[PDB]
Each structure stands twice: as structure tokens, then as C-alpha cells.
Amino acid sequence: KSAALHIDLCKATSPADALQYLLQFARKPVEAESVEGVVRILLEHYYKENDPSVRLKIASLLGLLSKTAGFSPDCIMDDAINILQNEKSHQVLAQLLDTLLAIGTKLPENQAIQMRLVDVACKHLTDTSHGVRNKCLQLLGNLGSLDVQKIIGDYFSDQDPRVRTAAIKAMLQLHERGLKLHQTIYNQACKLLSDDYEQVRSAAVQLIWVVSQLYPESIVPIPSSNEEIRLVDDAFGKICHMVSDGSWVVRVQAAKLLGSMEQVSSHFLEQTLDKKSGACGAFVHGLEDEMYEVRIAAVEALCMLAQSSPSFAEKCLDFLVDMFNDEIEEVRLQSIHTMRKISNNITLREDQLDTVLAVLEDSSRDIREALHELLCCTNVSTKEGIHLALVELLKNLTKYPTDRDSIWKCLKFLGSRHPTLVLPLVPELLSTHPFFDTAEPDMDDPAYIAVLVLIFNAAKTCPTMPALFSDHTFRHYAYLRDSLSHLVPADPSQQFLQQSLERVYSLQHLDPQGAQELLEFTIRDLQRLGELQSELAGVADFSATYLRCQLLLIKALQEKLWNVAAPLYLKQSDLASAAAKQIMEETYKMEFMYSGVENKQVVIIHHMRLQAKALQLIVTARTTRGLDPLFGMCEKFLQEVDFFQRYFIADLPHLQDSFVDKLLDLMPRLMTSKPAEVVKILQTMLRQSAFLHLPLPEQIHKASATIIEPAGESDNPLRFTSGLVVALDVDATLEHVQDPQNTVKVQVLYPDGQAQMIHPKPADFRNPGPGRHRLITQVYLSHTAWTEACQVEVRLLLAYNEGTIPFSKPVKVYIMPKPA
Amino acid sequence: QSEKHLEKILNVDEFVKRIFSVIHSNDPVARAITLRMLGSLASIIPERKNAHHSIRQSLDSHDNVEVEAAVFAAANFSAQSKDFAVG
């Protein structure tokens, strides 16, 4: 429709509605040859129109069409630079430079066109408009000559701050693309660091950090002194001064870049945490800033610099202790985490230790857990401090019994890493009288296990005094070794599954009764194998469902209805009609509740689906007296077979003697056959069809779902006003679901016929692990008045591309709509 | 005689605790009867670790009735718990 575009642009109007037509055209994709055609037409129409807005829209649409996927833009660059040659409007010129930047970015390999484009950018950099200079600097930054550094350094000193930011970001892009920068850049960015604009200062401090990282060991002179300073130290001082900026995002940027200057000398590192050149007190100022983001960024800068420099961590220590009590919870979480990170070899003295143990008493569980891992990773002398830590942990356990596992982990790590210090404390912890026979302490009392976990982990690395234990302490040691062994210290199935499957396959020549008996035996064995080997459970019930499909097919094909005529057929004792429906349900369950399926299994699944459809066709043909509905779904079945041969034509030569290839042999007869004869030949040809083989997947699991938050074991009704809503929270443990975002659905079933199906949003499908998903929705329930609190049925469902199948355990919730 | 009804008591912890309190009796006959209780209750207290420890300790006792009751309790708990079975 390129000629339609030509006609509509040159035939309706010039000034205004042409812009509307271009706007309407810009919203549809164009194929690459048609991209070339419309580019030629629009560039021909560019010279005709003298309206600048129409030409701006033309330039934008050229830039959009140059970004199409399959279109190589090498043939349109010359006309583009030709229309830049005689373009006077600055906005249209800026849009044209944007188009040229898209052209250059789409073709990185061609060096000649890149040199041409940077020549155009260098030509147009002297434009009076700031937008043209901005786009030309972006063009130089994106392409360059990896001369360009000198020109961008010249444009660091432009009058417009936007052009200055464009130049700094362009040369940062040059460094990021791979180009190595000069050193005069450092002086220019140092001059530009005191700019009156926020964005210029942020870009300049980024450039200062980059040029410091490029040449850390370079020696530069002080402007006001004879002494010489390393480049990384001087840039560290500049960024430390930028930490005290008036803009909070500039402070965050300065702190974050300050964290990555690991090559700074130690002297400036002790300077930056002091309170008495320009680096003095930078982190002290950053840790007390009003914006919590700056404090967080200074915390990570402290963490990185203390990980780099071990002598810095001792100075970091007391500031982290002071900033544990911070008004923002995320800030104190970060402070505790970084304190744990930098606690590799430094010891805690008394006041820092009991400040940590004082903030252990906090009501938030998150910082309590974080402080628990800090106590796991802490090193401490002065064993009375260890006793104080144990007392504070025990009273935390009394105040918060839910954290007993974390507290036991703390005491395991404290005993395992401070063995000699716990050793004199043992008679004070275990109430061991020197001569009295002490009463046996109550086991399963979480304070006493907490003491024993500390003691036993101390006794592991020190065998000097394990004889301080009494007899009941040794008995409790045995009990904890049996129960808490992770804390206290001191393929036949696959072969059987293959053998059972090949036993089924190799005995497919028996009588129908023997085949049913063999299939029942192997289904029972596969079910019990799934109940025994957990990692083979998915493949076990996968093959069990396949053999159940085959068993249902065999039992349906050996019914008493084939021995009676069509008028004498009676459906009130029928079995095959339910069998075909069951095979359909099992095939859908097989295809969609199994994670490890592939095409080599989907083809057999669809083959069994075809066999079930044929069986249902013959069953329905038994009970139909009219000729045209039978002909109708016979034609529908042959259409389904044609769709199957079209979709799965690649792996057709693997299904020897099966249903579908024996259909394909008789297919030209099948189009020309009378539909009752088609039904008869299908009935006689299902019984002669050979049983297929399942290619076993390497890794396959059932999609499992259980909900725990409705918790259908409480008989207390959930009361609300009739006609209003009541909210129900669910917590689903989805296991091995491939795409739970678009397949898992919540079904609520009221006691009447209402079966409202709820689609959860993707925002609350939490993924805490590989193959593990968590579903937390607040489903909404409403109905009018009930005379008694009946029930409601909550069920998870799996949806596929046409129907839905049950997915989880049915759970009943009591609901009592009271009248208003 | 009431094994099918003891799955519907739901105050399991204090009931089992007050039965289990007389595993510490010095009488070996009382210890044997409690081991037979634990084996009888093994359907509703699997993975109950103090019961496992009591069975393991009573298997090494010097009284024949207590050892026989510990064997009976171990046979019951091994059927209902795989963590008991592996050790």
C-alpha cells in the first residue's frame, strides 16, 4: 500500500491533514521491501513540502522505519545526508540526526558509513541550536572512531548545560564501547565538577570516576602545592567533596562511585571517616544525611571499601554500631548486612557487643534475622561477652520463640568458632553441681537445646574437655544427634521402569484379557514406584496415565455393544462412551500437567487423542439413526486427521503400523467412502492398530498444587453481610509449573451452580526457587442471604490453549452471608 | 482397640506428653508399656523425635520385656516414618 501512501499524501492536502495521515501510517509495521519503497516515496515527498512540522514528522518516520528488523539500511544513507545537506529547520535537523544515529547503530560492522556519519556529526556540531549539537554529540558517542575525544573535550565547555551533559555522556559512551580515554579529560571534568547544574555535576563525577579507574597510578601535581598526588587519590578527594553536594541524587551517585575506588591509598581512607584535604569527613557526612538513599549508598560504599581495605573495617565498625539505630528499617538492614560482611577478622569489644545485643531485642523479625546472621559471622574475645551474648539470645528466645532455628544456628556458629572461650563457661551453663547429682533437664525445652548446641559445637573442635558432661548430657547429645543432626556435630528404579515398559511393549500379542491384566499389573507397579522413588514419580505416573489410556481403549474395544446391531444398541449400560471421554481427559492431563514434555512425546499424546476421538465417533455413530449428523462429525474427524498429518508430518515415519499411518494408507478411499462404511472400517481398524512407544523424557515432573491458607479444617463460618463481599486469602504451593502466570487459575464454586473462575494477576506469582512458585491472591466472594452457613468450594485449575482441568486438592471454606 | 479413633483427637502434643512422662520411670514394666503405647500411637506421631530416642535407648536396656516392647515400637515406627527407619 505504498502507492496508496503516495496518492494520499500528494492528493488530499498539503499543510495539515498530511501530518494526520503520516501519524496514522506511523502506527503500523512495514515489510522490508515495502520499507524501501515507502522510504523512497517519503524522501521524494520531503522536498515538496515546505511546512517544517510535516518534514519533522517525515524525519521521525524515517527514523522509525530505519529501526525495522529485516530492512538493511545501507541503501538509504546517501539520500539521508543529501536531505541534511539543505535542511534549515533545527528541529527537523535534530530529528534527522536521530535518524542517522539509528542508521549507524543498526550497522556497527561497516566502518566506512560510520566514518561518514561522524564526519556529518563533526560538520553539524557548529549549529547554533542546542538540540542539533546534542544529537551530533550523541552521534559521535555512539559511533566515534574506535580526533573525537579532542572535539568532545572542546564541547565540554559549551554555554548550554544540556550540551555539556551530552558531551560528557557521549565520551562516557565512548569509554563504555571500548575506547581508552586521554588524561586531559581529568582536568576538564575537574573544572566542570563545580557546574551550576545538577546533571552536569552528576555526569562530571561519573567521568571523573571513569578516568580515575583508567589511570589510577598516574601522578598529577597539586595546583597550589609542590607535592604530587596519585590520580586515584585526587579523584577520590573530588568525589568525596561531591558527597557534600546540594542535590541528593548527586550525593547518591558520589557515594556509589566512591565505593568502587578500591585503589585509593590508605591515608585518605582513614581521612574519610575522621571528624576533625577535601576527603575529610565525607562518609561521616554521608551517614547522617537526611535522605535515606544517601545513607544506604554510603553504607554500601563503606562495605566495598572495608572489603578492599582490612584496616578500614575497624574505623567502619563504630559508625555501623551507631547507625544500627536508624530511623529507616532498610538502612539498618543494610548496616547489619554490611557489618556481617566486614566482620571477617576484627574482634568486638564490650560496648559494641552489648549495643548489638541491645538491638537484638527489636520487634522486627527481619532485622532480628539479619542480626542473627551477624552473630553467626562475628568474632569476639572476652568470654564473659560470649556469656552475655548467650543470655541475650536466650531472652530473645523467650521473648520470640519463633526464631528458635535461627538462634540455634547462632549458637552453633558461636560454639564452632569460639571453642576455647566457651570451655570455662560450661559449668555455669549446664547446672553441674560439683558433688550433687543434678536433675535431668527437660528435653524439647528450646532454651536447653540452645545451651547444648552452643556447648556441643564448642566440644567438636576442642576434645580437651568433653568429660565435663554428665550422663544425661550424653543421653541428650545422642538425642540431638538423632534429631538436630544438621546443627550438633559428631539406578535400579529407572531400570525397573524401562523393564516394565518394554514388558508392556513386547507382550502386545496377547488376548484382550491378558493385555488388560498386564496393563493393570504395570499400572499398579508404576504407581507404587512413583510412591517410592520421588525423583521418578513424574515419569512413573506419566507412563501410568499412558497405559491407563491404552487400557481404557482396549476395554472399550472389547465391549458387548459390538456384538449387537445398531437398533439393538442401548446406552444405559454403555461403557465405551465414558471411556473415550476419560482418554480425552487423560491426554489433556498428560500434555499439560507435565513439565518435561517435548514434541517426541506430544506426537504420541495427540495420536492417543486421535484414537479417543475415533472411538467416540464410532460410539456416537452406534446411537445415531440419521445419516447427516453422522456424516457431519465423520467429516469433522477426517478434518482432524488431516490437521494431524499436516502438523506432525516430520515424525510420521516413526509411527509404524499405528492408527494414523494405517489411516493414511486408506485415506483416498476414506474421502470417497460412505460414512457408515468409514465408521465400520474405523471400528475394525482400531482393533488392529499397534500400540505405540513413549520416548521417555530425561527430566519430567508432575505439576503439583496445594493450597494451605484457606485451610479447610475449621468449622467456623466466615460471616459477612448479604450482597456485600468477603475476602478469602489463598497460599498455593505450585510445584513444577512451566508457565503459572497464564495457566494457573483459581476456581470458586458456590453451593449453587455458580462456578466463578478467577484469573490471578502475574504480579503475585512469587517464584522462591527453581520449579517452585507461590500464589497469594485475595479472592472475593459474595452471595445473597443464606439460612445456614453452607460451604464454598475453592479449587486451583490449569488452563490450556480451550479448556480447563482440575489442578489442586478440593478445599471447602465455610461462608455465612448474614442479612443486613 | 481404638486405633481408628485416635486420629481424631487433635490435642496430640499434651496427650502424648503426659503418656511419655512415664518413659522415665525406673520400672522396666512401665517403660515397656509406654513403648507399646508409642508403637500403638505411631500412626499419629510419626517423626516425633523423643519417641524415636526412647525406642533407641530402650533397645539397649537390660530388661527383656522393655527390649521386646522397644522392638515392637520400632517395628511400628519404621512402618510409619522413614526418618526413624534410616538410623
PDB file of C-alpha atoms in Angstrom, chain A residues 327-545:
ATOM      1  CA  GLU A 327      15.037   5.713  61.664  1.00  0.00           C
ATOM      2  CA  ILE A 328      14.601   3.735  58.408  1.00  0.00           C
ATOM      3  CA  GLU A 329      14.391  -0.059  58.582  1.00  0.00           C
ATOM      4  CA  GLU A 330      16.030  -0.641  55.189  1.00  0.00           C
ATOM      5  CA  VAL A 331      19.014   1.445  56.297  1.00  0.00           C
ATOM      6  CA  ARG A 332      19.546  -0.615  59.446  1.00  0.00           C
ATOM      7  CA  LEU A 333      19.062  -3.852  57.481  1.00  0.00           C
ATOM      8  CA  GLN A 334      21.822  -2.706  55.137  1.00  0.00           C
ATOM      9  CA  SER A 335      24.037  -1.648  58.051  1.00  0.00           C
ATOM     10  CA  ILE A 336      23.667  -5.042  59.758  1.00  0.00           C
ATOM     11  CA  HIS A 337      24.293  -6.898  56.476  1.00  0.00           C
ATOM     12  CA  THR A 338      27.442  -4.920  55.683  1.00  0.00           C
ATOM     13  CA  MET A 339      28.618  -5.315  59.281  1.00  0.00           C
ATOM     14  CA  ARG A 340      28.289  -9.071  58.794  1.00  0.00           C
ATOM     15  CA  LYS A 341      30.200  -8.746  55.520  1.00  0.00           C
ATOM     16  CA  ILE A 342      33.140  -6.840  57.042  1.00  0.00           C
ATOM     17  CA  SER A 343      33.413  -8.931  60.243  1.00  0.00           C
ATOM     18  CA  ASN A 344      35.998 -11.278  58.728  1.00  0.00           C
ATOM     19  CA  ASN A 345      38.812 -10.947  61.286  1.00  0.00           C
ATOM     20  CA  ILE A 346      38.096  -7.967  63.569  1.00  0.00           C
ATOM     21  CA  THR A 347      37.027  -8.564  67.160  1.00  0.00           C
ATOM     22  CA  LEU A 348      34.231  -6.807  69.034  1.00  0.00           C
ATOM     23  CA  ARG A 349      34.897  -5.214  72.403  1.00  0.00           C
ATOM     24  CA  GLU A 350      32.339  -4.799  75.177  1.00  0.00           C
ATOM     25  CA  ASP A 351      30.292  -1.731  74.232  1.00  0.00           C
ATOM     26  CA  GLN A 352      29.893  -2.639  70.550  1.00  0.00           C
ATOM     27  CA  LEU A 353      28.923  -6.183  71.553  1.00  0.00           C
ATOM     28  CA  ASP A 354      26.246  -5.187  74.013  1.00  0.00           C
ATOM     29  CA  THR A 355      24.932  -2.497  71.659  1.00  0.00           C
ATOM     30  CA  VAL A 356      24.414  -5.316  69.135  1.00  0.00           C
ATOM     31  CA  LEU A 357      22.823  -7.417  71.866  1.00  0.00           C
ATOM     32  CA  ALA A 358      20.635  -4.467  72.888  1.00  0.00           C
ATOM     33  CA  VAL A 359      19.324  -4.023  69.346  1.00  0.00           C
ATOM     34  CA  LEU A 360      18.698  -7.777  69.301  1.00  0.00           C
ATOM     35  CA  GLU A 361      15.581  -7.003  71.390  1.00  0.00           C
ATOM     36  CA  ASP A 362      13.795  -5.295  68.478  1.00  0.00           C
ATOM     37  CA  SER A 363      10.284  -6.337  67.454  1.00  0.00           C
ATOM     38  CA  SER A 364      11.042  -6.545  63.720  1.00  0.00           C
ATOM     39  CA  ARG A 365      11.727 -10.118  62.650  1.00  0.00           C
ATOM     40  CA  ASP A 366      13.758  -9.086  59.593  1.00  0.00           C
ATOM     41  CA  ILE A 367      16.471  -7.160  61.416  1.00  0.00           C
ATOM     42  CA  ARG A 368      16.447  -9.841  64.121  1.00  0.00           C
ATOM     43  CA  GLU A 369      17.237 -12.453  61.462  1.00  0.00           C
ATOM     44  CA  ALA A 370      19.902 -10.219  59.894  1.00  0.00           C
ATOM     45  CA  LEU A 371      21.479  -9.592  63.291  1.00  0.00           C
ATOM     46  CA  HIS A 372      21.315 -13.347  63.851  1.00  0.00           C
ATOM     47  CA  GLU A 373      23.474 -13.954  60.784  1.00  0.00           C
ATOM     48  CA  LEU A 374      25.798 -11.191  62.009  1.00  0.00           C
ATOM     49  CA  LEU A 375      26.155 -13.051  65.316  1.00  0.00           C
ATOM     50  CA  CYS A 376      26.788 -16.165  63.223  1.00  0.00           C
ATOM     51  CA  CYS A 377      29.629 -14.357  61.441  1.00  0.00           C
ATOM     52  CA  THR A 378      31.021 -12.371  64.390  1.00  0.00           C
ATOM     53  CA  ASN A 379      34.357 -12.863  66.155  1.00  0.00           C
ATOM     54  CA  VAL A 380      34.646 -11.946  69.829  1.00  0.00           C
ATOM     55  CA  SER A 381      37.160 -12.344  72.669  1.00  0.00           C
ATOM     56  CA  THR A 382      36.498 -11.946  76.466  1.00  0.00           C
ATOM     57  CA  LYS A 383      34.285 -14.993  77.136  1.00  0.00           C
ATOM     58  CA  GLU A 384      32.070 -13.020  79.539  1.00  0.00           C
ATOM     59  CA  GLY A 385      30.989 -11.266  76.346  1.00  0.00           C
ATOM     60  CA  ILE A 386      30.084 -14.684  74.941  1.00  0.00           C
ATOM     61  CA  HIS A 387      28.088 -15.378  78.106  1.00  0.00           C
ATOM     62  CA  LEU A 388      26.351 -12.015  77.639  1.00  0.00           C
ATOM     63  CA  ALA A 389      25.598 -12.955  74.023  1.00  0.00           C
ATOM     64  CA  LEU A 390      24.114 -16.257  75.182  1.00  0.00           C
ATOM     65  CA  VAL A 391      21.985 -14.525  77.840  1.00  0.00           C
ATOM     66  CA  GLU A 392      20.669 -12.001  75.317  1.00  0.00           C
ATOM     67  CA  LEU A 393      19.978 -14.755  72.772  1.00  0.00           C
ATOM     68  CA  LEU A 394      18.138 -16.809  75.405  1.00  0.00           C
ATOM     69  CA  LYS A 395      15.969 -13.881  76.463  1.00  0.00           C
ATOM     70  CA  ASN A 396      15.302 -13.170  72.779  1.00  0.00           C
ATOM     71  CA  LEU A 397      14.225 -16.815  72.505  1.00  0.00           C
ATOM     72  CA  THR A 398      11.922 -16.327  75.490  1.00  0.00           C
ATOM     73  CA  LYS A 399      10.540 -13.099  74.017  1.00  0.00           C
ATOM     74  CA  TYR A 400      10.319 -14.509  70.463  1.00  0.00           C
ATOM     75  CA  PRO A 401      10.062 -18.314  70.305  1.00  0.00           C
ATOM     76  CA  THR A 402       9.544 -18.395  66.525  1.00  0.00           C
ATOM     77  CA  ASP A 403      13.238 -17.612  65.906  1.00  0.00           C
ATOM     78  CA  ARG A 404      14.490 -20.768  67.645  1.00  0.00           C
ATOM     79  CA  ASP A 405      16.053 -22.259  64.500  1.00  0.00           C
ATOM     80  CA  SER A 406      17.968 -19.050  63.772  1.00  0.00           C
ATOM     81  CA  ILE A 407      19.069 -18.780  67.414  1.00  0.00           C
ATOM     82  CA  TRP A 408      20.264 -22.397  67.322  1.00  0.00           C
ATOM     83  CA  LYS A 409      22.218 -21.569  64.155  1.00  0.00           C
ATOM     84  CA  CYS A 410      23.732 -18.592  66.002  1.00  0.00           C
ATOM     85  CA  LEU A 411      24.816 -20.751  68.909  1.00  0.00           C
ATOM     86  CA  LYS A 412      26.195 -23.415  66.564  1.00  0.00           C
ATOM     87  CA  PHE A 413      28.337 -20.798  64.830  1.00  0.00           C
ATOM     88  CA  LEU A 414      29.373 -19.242  68.151  1.00  0.00           C
ATOM     89  CA  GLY A 415      30.444 -22.582  69.607  1.00  0.00           C
ATOM     90  CA  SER A 416      32.170 -23.733  66.426  1.00  0.00           C
ATOM     91  CA  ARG A 417      34.291 -20.581  66.085  1.00  0.00           C
ATOM     92  CA  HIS A 418      34.944 -19.642  69.741  1.00  0.00           C
ATOM     93  CA  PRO A 419      35.769 -23.051  71.225  1.00  0.00           C
ATOM     94  CA  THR A 420      38.284 -22.208  73.945  1.00  0.00           C
ATOM     95  CA  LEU A 421      36.212 -19.338  75.348  1.00  0.00           C
ATOM     96  CA  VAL A 422      33.068 -21.449  75.889  1.00  0.00           C
ATOM     97  CA  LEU A 423      35.123 -24.108  77.711  1.00  0.00           C
ATOM     98  CA  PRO A 424      35.397 -22.355  81.137  1.00  0.00           C
ATOM     99  CA  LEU A 425      31.731 -21.331  80.837  1.00  0.00           C
ATOM    100  CA  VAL A 426      30.413 -24.923  80.695  1.00  0.00           C
ATOM    101  CA  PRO A 427      29.823 -25.483  84.468  1.00  0.00           C
ATOM    102  CA  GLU A 428      27.968 -22.153  84.535  1.00  0.00           C
ATOM    103  CA  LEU A 429      25.684 -23.119  81.628  1.00  0.00           C
ATOM    104  CA  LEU A 430      24.935 -26.739  82.453  1.00  0.00           C
ATOM    105  CA  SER A 431      23.825 -26.586  86.081  1.00  0.00           C
ATOM    106  CA  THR A 432      26.539 -29.033  87.171  1.00  0.00           C
ATOM    107  CA  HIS A 433      26.933 -29.139  90.929  1.00  0.00           C
ATOM    108  CA  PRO A 434      30.435 -30.291  91.977  1.00  0.00           C
ATOM    109  CA  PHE A 435      29.091 -33.191  94.056  1.00  0.00           C
ATOM    110  CA  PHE A 436      25.291 -33.237  93.873  1.00  0.00           C
ATOM    111  CA  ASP A 437      23.598 -35.494  91.344  1.00  0.00           C
ATOM    112  CA  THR A 438      21.767 -32.936  89.227  1.00  0.00           C
ATOM    113  CA  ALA A 439      18.250 -33.474  87.936  1.00  0.00           C
ATOM    114  CA  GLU A 440      17.985 -34.298  84.248  1.00  0.00           C
ATOM    115  CA  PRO A 441      16.943 -31.133  82.373  1.00  0.00           C
ATOM    116  CA  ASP A 442      13.733 -31.187  80.382  1.00  0.00           C
ATOM    117  CA  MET A 443      14.427 -32.108  76.778  1.00  0.00           C
ATOM    118  CA  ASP A 444      12.496 -30.329  73.998  1.00  0.00           C
ATOM    119  CA  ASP A 445      12.830 -27.109  76.030  1.00  0.00           C
ATOM    120  CA  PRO A 446      14.213 -24.617  73.488  1.00  0.00           C
ATOM    121  CA  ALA A 447      16.452 -22.786  75.959  1.00  0.00           C
ATOM    122  CA  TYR A 448      18.160 -26.048  76.919  1.00  0.00           C
ATOM    123  CA  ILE A 449      18.792 -27.178  73.331  1.00  0.00           C
ATOM    124  CA  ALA A 450      20.162 -23.682  72.670  1.00  0.00           C
ATOM    125  CA  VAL A 451      22.654 -24.135  75.510  1.00  0.00           C
ATOM    126  CA  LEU A 452      23.540 -27.644  74.311  1.00  0.00           C
ATOM    127  CA  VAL A 453      24.006 -26.554  70.684  1.00  0.00           C
ATOM    128  CA  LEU A 454      26.497 -23.941  71.901  1.00  0.00           C
ATOM    129  CA  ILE A 455      28.259 -26.484  74.118  1.00  0.00           C
ATOM    130  CA  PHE A 456      28.451 -29.376  71.645  1.00  0.00           C
ATOM    131  CA  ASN A 457      29.757 -27.245  68.779  1.00  0.00           C
ATOM    132  CA  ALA A 458      32.415 -25.941  71.168  1.00  0.00           C
ATOM    133  CA  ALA A 459      33.307 -29.535  72.058  1.00  0.00           C
ATOM    134  CA  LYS A 460      33.731 -30.598  68.414  1.00  0.00           C
ATOM    135  CA  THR A 461      36.939 -28.669  67.747  1.00  0.00           C
ATOM    136  CA  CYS A 462      38.177 -28.929  71.347  1.00  0.00           C
ATOM    137  CA  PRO A 463      38.446 -32.534  72.582  1.00  0.00           C
ATOM    138  CA  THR A 464      40.362 -31.211  75.593  1.00  0.00           C
ATOM    139  CA  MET A 465      37.383 -31.370  77.986  1.00  0.00           C
ATOM    140  CA  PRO A 466      34.395 -33.395  76.784  1.00  0.00           C
ATOM    141  CA  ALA A 467      34.424 -35.286  80.110  1.00  0.00           C
ATOM    142  CA  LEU A 468      32.707 -32.353  81.843  1.00  0.00           C
ATOM    143  CA  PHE A 469      29.445 -33.837  80.536  1.00  0.00           C
ATOM    144  CA  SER A 470      27.212 -35.784  82.892  1.00  0.00           C
ATOM    145  CA  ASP A 471      25.397 -38.974  81.894  1.00  0.00           C
ATOM    146  CA  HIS A 472      22.130 -37.253  80.982  1.00  0.00           C
ATOM    147  CA  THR A 473      24.057 -34.715  78.912  1.00  0.00           C
ATOM    148  CA  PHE A 474      25.487 -37.619  76.896  1.00  0.00           C
ATOM    149  CA  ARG A 475      21.962 -39.012  76.513  1.00  0.00           C
ATOM    150  CA  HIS A 476      20.795 -35.591  75.325  1.00  0.00           C
ATOM    151  CA  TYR A 477      23.785 -35.490  72.967  1.00  0.00           C
ATOM    152  CA  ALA A 478      22.539 -38.741  71.443  1.00  0.00           C
ATOM    153  CA  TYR A 479      19.000 -37.321  71.248  1.00  0.00           C
ATOM    154  CA  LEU A 480      20.137 -34.131  69.499  1.00  0.00           C
ATOM    155  CA  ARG A 481      22.372 -36.128  67.147  1.00  0.00           C
ATOM    156  CA  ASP A 482      19.310 -38.185  66.235  1.00  0.00           C
ATOM    157  CA  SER A 483      17.038 -35.131  65.899  1.00  0.00           C
ATOM    158  CA  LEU A 484      19.069 -31.978  65.178  1.00  0.00           C
ATOM    159  CA  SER A 485      21.943 -33.561  63.239  1.00  0.00           C
ATOM    160  CA  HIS A 486      22.263 -30.532  60.939  1.00  0.00           C
ATOM    161  CA  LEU A 487      23.220 -28.416  63.984  1.00  0.00           C
ATOM    162  CA  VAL A 488      25.031 -30.634  66.505  1.00  0.00           C
ATOM    163  CA  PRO A 489      28.181 -32.301  65.110  1.00  0.00           C
ATOM    164  CA  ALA A 490      29.751 -35.658  65.902  1.00  0.00           C
ATOM    165  CA  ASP A 491      19.618 -46.819  39.203  1.00  0.00           C
ATOM    166  CA  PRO A 492      17.517 -49.924  39.917  1.00  0.00           C
ATOM    167  CA  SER A 493      14.271 -47.923  39.794  1.00  0.00           C
ATOM    168  CA  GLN A 494      14.960 -46.484  36.330  1.00  0.00           C
ATOM    169  CA  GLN A 495      15.960 -49.950  35.123  1.00  0.00           C
ATOM    170  CA  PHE A 496      12.718 -51.391  36.511  1.00  0.00           C
ATOM    171  CA  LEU A 497      10.654 -48.669  34.835  1.00  0.00           C
ATOM    172  CA  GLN A 498      12.332 -49.384  31.492  1.00  0.00           C
ATOM    173  CA  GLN A 499      11.895 -53.137  32.029  1.00  0.00           C
ATOM    174  CA  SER A 500       8.185 -52.802  32.840  1.00  0.00           C
ATOM    175  CA  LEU A 501       7.604 -50.535  29.838  1.00  0.00           C
ATOM    176  CA  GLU A 502       9.369 -52.930  27.467  1.00  0.00           C
ATOM    177  CA  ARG A 503       7.460 -55.827  29.047  1.00  0.00           C
ATOM    178  CA  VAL A 504       4.251 -53.996  28.132  1.00  0.00           C
ATOM    179  CA  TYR A 505       5.548 -53.254  24.628  1.00  0.00           C
ATOM    180  CA  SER A 506       6.848 -56.772  23.921  1.00  0.00           C
ATOM    181  CA  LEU A 507       3.654 -58.552  25.048  1.00  0.00           C
ATOM    182  CA  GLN A 508       1.222 -56.736  22.745  1.00  0.00           C
ATOM    183  CA  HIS A 509       0.214 -60.002  21.018  1.00  0.00           C
ATOM    184  CA  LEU A 510      -1.925 -61.488  23.796  1.00  0.00           C
ATOM    185  CA  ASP A 511      -5.642 -61.985  24.262  1.00  0.00           C
ATOM    186  CA  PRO A 512      -7.602 -58.899  25.404  1.00  0.00           C
ATOM    187  CA  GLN A 513      -7.974 -60.338  28.914  1.00  0.00           C
ATOM    188  CA  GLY A 514      -4.229 -60.933  29.165  1.00  0.00           C
ATOM    189  CA  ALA A 515      -3.490 -57.465  27.792  1.00  0.00           C
ATOM    190  CA  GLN A 516      -5.824 -55.915  30.373  1.00  0.00           C
ATOM    191  CA  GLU A 517      -4.174 -57.964  33.132  1.00  0.00           C
ATOM    192  CA  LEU A 518      -0.674 -56.926  32.024  1.00  0.00           C
ATOM    193  CA  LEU A 519      -1.672 -53.263  31.793  1.00  0.00           C
ATOM    194  CA  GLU A 520      -3.297 -53.384  35.241  1.00  0.00           C
ATOM    195  CA  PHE A 521      -0.187 -55.005  36.739  1.00  0.00           C
ATOM    196  CA  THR A 522       2.151 -52.471  35.161  1.00  0.00           C
ATOM    197  CA  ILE A 523      -0.061 -49.505  36.117  1.00  0.00           C
ATOM    198  CA  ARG A 524      -0.073 -50.726  39.730  1.00  0.00           C
ATOM    199  CA  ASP A 525       3.707 -51.206  39.659  1.00  0.00           C
ATOM    200  CA  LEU A 526       4.289 -47.752  38.157  1.00  0.00           C
ATOM    201  CA  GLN A 527       2.004 -46.132  40.741  1.00  0.00           C
ATOM    202  CA  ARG A 528       3.833 -47.832  43.606  1.00  0.00           C
ATOM    203  CA  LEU A 529       7.206 -46.952  42.042  1.00  0.00           C
ATOM    204  CA  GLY A 530       6.075 -43.331  41.946  1.00  0.00           C
ATOM    205  CA  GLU A 531       5.157 -43.686  45.616  1.00  0.00           C
ATOM    206  CA  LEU A 532       8.680 -44.997  46.353  1.00  0.00           C
ATOM    207  CA  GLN A 533      11.220 -43.172  44.155  1.00  0.00           C
ATOM    208  CA  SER A 534      10.363 -39.482  44.437  1.00  0.00           C
ATOM    209  CA  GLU A 535      12.510 -38.284  41.527  1.00  0.00           C
ATOM    210  CA  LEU A 536      10.918 -40.856  39.188  1.00  0.00           C
ATOM    211  CA  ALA A 537       7.358 -40.120  40.347  1.00  0.00           C
ATOM    212  CA  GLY A 538       6.581 -37.819  37.423  1.00  0.00           C
ATOM    213  CA  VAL A 539       7.754 -40.221  34.731  1.00  0.00           C
ATOM    214  CA  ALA A 540       6.072 -43.083  36.616  1.00  0.00           C
ATOM    215  CA  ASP A 541       2.607 -41.549  36.620  1.00  0.00           C
ATOM    216  CA  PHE A 542       3.205 -40.172  33.107  1.00  0.00           C
ATOM    217  CA  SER A 543       3.699 -43.709  31.804  1.00  0.00           C
ATOM    218  CA  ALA A 544       0.906 -44.908  34.108  1.00  0.00           C
ATOM    219  CA  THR A 545      -1.530 -42.436  32.542  1.00  0.00           C
TER     220      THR A 545
END
